[PDB]
Design a protein around this nucleic acid. Sequence first.
RNA 1: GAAGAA
Length: 99
Amino acid sequence: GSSGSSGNRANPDPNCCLGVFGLSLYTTERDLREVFSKYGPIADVSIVYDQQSRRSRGFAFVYFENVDDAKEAKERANGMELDGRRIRVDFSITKRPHT
RNA sequence: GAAGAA
């Protein structure tokens, strides 16, 4: 079947950017930042939204200022509970920032 | 009556 480096998403690798999945529709970027900034410094946080209704799609991303604090948070928050939903967490394979 | 790369 189909397969490619950094296109596959069930086999991530370390990155300052983390993805967060399973979220409740009432979660804000501020709740994610208060829950993840206890593991280290965070420059930004962004929830992913529907284009026609502006509701959350159930996933988001968290941008640390260091890969080793992202390696901490990725192991800390994977399988935790937030607003009555379990969340899962992994390193970003791709991201909106670029340099 | 998916909880996954924007």
